[PDB]
Structure formats: structure tokens, C-alpha cells
DNA sequence: GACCACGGCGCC
DNA sequence: CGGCGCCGTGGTC
Ligand SMILES: COc1cc2ccccc2cc1[C@H]1C[C@H](O)[C@@H](COP(=O)(O)OP(=O)(O)OP(=O)(O)O)O1
């Protein structure tokens with residue numbers, strides 16, 4: 001019993017659609033349909049039929065909305081059961097997974113996807129009745145955010161292709177030089193991109209000591225960590241590290257990105273996946289524009305290739321230490337709150353209470369160490385690991401850990417309070433009430449239990465930070481539109497905007513305020529803002 | 541031509 | 553001994 005009716009569908013219908021490939025900016029729309037009351041309407045011509053819809057409503061609504069924006073159609077995404085499912089349990093990441101769990105079959109037919117969307121929305125919307133915090137997240141953050149992401153994906157970012165093509169040649173010559181030297185020291189050619197062949201050269205032929213093994217197969221590891229500890233053992237090691245650095249950036253960024261420029265837009269379009277992480281973070285893929293290099297000198301050159309349209313500037317806004325500020329709020333630790341209320345640099349404050357200097361006498365050597373202890377405790381770093389990263393005895397690493405919690409006792413209290421709650425309810429929660437179900441919190445194997453604990457007490461911090469960024473994007477986007485400005489990229493605690501040259505300053509100031517005041521905490525949120533013609537100079 | 545597992549590594 | 557996605561290799565159908 002499957003009711004069929006002629007195109008077009010009534011208002012409020014749930015859409016189903018089939019793409020030739022997973023990227024909506026690149027996809028051919030193969031079929032389109034819509035279902036209401038279980039009655040399914042199928043479009044004779046999908047592209048024409050797109051014009052008849054008022055909104056995109058159903059599984060993966062954002063994807064269809066991106067394709068529609070590509071065709072110059074204003075078809076905003078509305079209700080999407082994936083978002084509901086994801087808020088219920090962020091392990092719900094795919095239509096297939098959601099259908100398997102809650103009911104139905106995710107197939108490759110437009111009509112059935114449309115019918116499935118409606119059935120899943122009814123089912124899932126009902127499971128959320130009573131869950132007012134989850135429903136607030138849905139109505140106020142996720143659903144409106146999906147429209148923000150749709151415009152971000154369809155706008156894309158301009159890329160300096162010629163610059164990257166020239167950068168490619170230059171890096172290739174450096175790669176060729178390093179390869180020759182490695183062959184010389186090895187005494188023969190081999191595939192240097194093959195870790196299996198490298199393993200033999202290093203540990204069988206040159207007889208260097210094997211330090212660690214790989215997780216699944218127990219091979220001798222050639223990871224950067226192992227090679228770092230082996231720098232002094234042979235001149236070939238340092239050469240391999242340099243090689244790895246260059247080929248990593250060339251094979252992942254320099255060479256592939258130029259070929260991903262879209263013919264219609266002349267820009268580069270990523271995908272912002274809204275139901276992909278266990279914490280409420282977004283992810284970026286096809287290509288991933290959330291891991292563009294920045295740390296090393298060659299990486300910074302890649303950033304310069306991301307630029308603004310002619311007559312526009314890039315506006316880069318970054319939350320300063322958002323996770324620690326969230327931690328201050330959640331824990332209520334008076335010491336940690338004080339640091340932020342007085343506008344001091346926690347990383348610099350840490351180094352002072354580590355090296356016994358005052359906050360003025362802290363060089364980057366000591367702030368680099370402060371970073372380690374601060375993030376180490378946030379993520380559950382072990383004493384052994386800390387002793388290695390700081391190059392200190394294991395016993396004084398233990399003492400540093402204890403001194404930290406002695407200085408921030410409410411943090412320790414909050415961790416333990418969060419885990420007990422986790423053990424009891426079976427999930428942990430962000431400030432806004434986003435949930436992550438964490439099993440094995442009471443596992444009888446210590447290593448399993450403790451791994452689960454770190455996941456558990458991390459999620460409220462990372463997830464709250466994610467909620468604040470997401471909400472800021474929701475509030476900011478319509479202010480950007482009314483100023484003729486664009487949202488281009490989100491990198492977890494960073495936003496990149498594009499604005500006309502003249503309004504760039506006013507957009508920068510406004511965006512800063514909206515982000516800083518998105519949701520007031522016991523501590524202020526500070527936002528570093530910068531303006532430039534490219535991503536590097538903008539952040540500089 | 542397609543797929544997948546693994547080690548390895550880019551970013552927050 | 554926190555959260556992601558992409559690469560090349562080696563193997564397979
Ligand atoms: C595994 O976790 C980490 C451990 C670290 C240990 C030592 C050093 C760095 C580390 C970085 C990270 C991850 C997690 C972090 O969110 C991200 C950015 O780290 P930034 O260096 O940008 O820290 P900020 O506070 O922005 O410093 P600043 O910009 O204000 O000077 O990298």
C-alpha cells in the first residue's frame with residue numbers, strides 16, 4: 001500500500017532526492033520526489049521540479065539546498081530527521097544508520113527516501129517531546145544552522161591557483177633533492193612513501209633501534225614520534241622527516257586543491273557535515289578545509305593561497321582559549337575564573353606557576369610547556385606522557401599533575417561530578433544539554449574504563465565550545481546578509497568571513513561583538529579579529 | 541575501475 | 553598510554 005500522486009506536492013511535504021555523487025556542488029540531480037500523508041509525488045524532470053518547492057524538508061535537506069543554491073534557487077533547508085536523531089544520540093550520523101535503528105530502509109529511490117523522511121520525522125519528533133533542552137537546540141541552533149551551512153557551502157572560497165601551481169614546482173625540487181640524499185645514505189633507491197620499505201631500510205639494513213610498534217599489525221613504527229627519538233642515531237632520519245613534511249603538504253593540499261575549483265563559481269566548495277562528531281562539533285570534507293596547514297613555514301604559504309574576491313577582504317575571528325573558558329564556567333573554579341576576568345593569559349599564568357618566573361619573564365619555551373600541562377589535563381594526559389613532552393622525571397610529572405588540581409580543586413570536583421553523573425545516567429551533557437552516551441564508564445578493565453572517562457569529561461567542554469560557536473553563527477549570519485557580507489569557513493573555534501572592502505571594518509566589529517556576547521558566561525569571551533586579502537595576512 | 545585496512549599526519 | 557578527514561601503500565574483486 002503505497003499511494004502515488006502527480007507532481008507537484010502540497011505544502012509541508014517531505015522531499016526525497018538522489019544525487020550522482022555525494023558532493024552537492026558537483027552532483028547531477030538524478031531524481032526528486034516528495035511525500036505527505038504517506039502519499040508520494042515523483043517529479044518527471046528533477047531540475048525543473050526544484051522550482052516548485054518552497055523549502056527543502058527531509059533527510060539531508062541541506063545537501064539539496066546547496067544544489068538548489070548552485071542553480072540560483074532560494075530553497076532553504078527546514079526540518080531534517082538526521083538533526084533530531086543526532087541530538088538524541090550523536091552516534092546517529094547517517095540516514096542508513098538512523099533507519100536501521102529507528103525503522104525503515106534507506107534505499108536509492110527518491111520516492112522511498114521522501115516517504116522514509118516523513119516517517120522518521122514523525123517517529124523522532126515524538127521521541128523528543130518532553131526533551132525541552134534538546135528541542136531548544138534543534139529549533140535555535142541546529143535547524144537554523146543548516147541554512148547557514150548551506151550558504152557557506154554554496155559560496156565556496158576563492159583560491160590562488162597560479163600561486164599554488166608555482167608553489168608545487170618549487171616544493172617538488174626540494175622533494176627531489178631530499179629523496180636523492182636519502183637514497184645515498186640508504187645506499188639504494190626504494191619507495192620512501194612506503195612505510196613497509198622504510199621499516200626495512202631503517203631497522204634491518206641500517207640497524208637502528210626499533211622503539212615502538214604499530215597498533216593493529218605490530219610492525220616496527222616509522223612515525224614522526226619514533227623518528228624524532230632517532231634523530232641522533234643516523235643522518236638519514238632527519239632527512240626523512242623533512243621529506244615527510246614536504247610530501248604531506250604537496251599530496252594533500254598543494255596538488256589536489258587547484259583541481260577542485262568549480263567551473264560555475266570559480267571557487268572551492270567544501271562540505272560542512274552537521275551530524276558527524278560525537279561531541280557536537282562540525283566536520284569538513286570533500287575537501288576538508290578545517291585542516292589547512294598553518295604551523296610550519298611551508299604551511300603558512302599554503303594559507304596565502306586562500307584569498308578574497310576582487311574588491312573584498314577576508315575577516316578572520318578566533319575565540320581565545322574557548323575550552324579553558326568553558327571549563328572555568330562549568331567548574332566554577334574561582335582561581336580559573338579570576339584569570340579570565342582580569343584578562344590574563346592562562347598559558348602565561350601557567351608558565352609563571354611552573355617555572356617560578358613572573359608573567360613578564362615567560363619566553364615561548366615556557367609558554368609551549370604551559371600549553372602542554374593545560375591541555376594535557378583537559379584531555380587526561382598521563383604522567384608518563386607529560387614527563388616525556390616536558391623532558392622531566394616521571395616522579396616530578398606526577399607532582400605537576402597534583403599541583404595543578406591543588407590549584408584548581410573545583411576542576412577536579414567537576415570532573416568527578418561529571419563522571420558520576422555519566423555512570424548514573426549513561427550520558428554526559430554540555431551546558432545547553434547536548435548529550436553524548438558514554439558506555440564502559442563502569443567497565444571492569446581499567447584501560448577501557450579510563451579511556452571512556454576521558455571521553456566523558458571532555459565532551460561537555462568540547463561540546464559546549466561547539467554549541468557557542470554554532471549559536472554565534474546562527475545569530476551572525478542574518479547580520480552579515482543585511483551588510484552584504486559572507487560567511488565562508490568555520491574551523492571549530494574560528495570563523496572566516498568575506499566582506500566588501502568598504503564595509504570590512506564594520507563587519508569585523510559587529511561579528512566580534514556577536515561572537516563575544518553569544519551567551520554570557522561567568523568569564524568573558526574574547527575574540528581576536530583580523531582583516532586581510534588572504535587567510536594568512538588576515539590572521540596576521 | 542572500484543573498494544577497504546592500515547599507518548601516518550594535517551588541523552582545532 | 554579530547555575531536556576529526558585525507559593521503560599513499562598494499563591487497564582485493
Ligand atoms: C592535543 O591537544 C593539543 C595539545 C597541545 C600541547 C602543547 C601545545 C599545543 C597543543 C595543542 C593541542 C591542540 C588542541 C588545541 O585546541 C589546538 C590548538 O592549540 P594552540 O597552540 O592554538 O592553543 P592556544 O590556546 O590557541 O594557544 P595560543 O594560540 O593562544 O597561543 O591544538
Ligand SMILES: [Mg+2]
Pocket residue numbers: none
Ligand atoms: Mg590558537
Ligand SMILES: [Mg+2]
Pocket residue numbers: none
Ligand atoms: Mg584510521
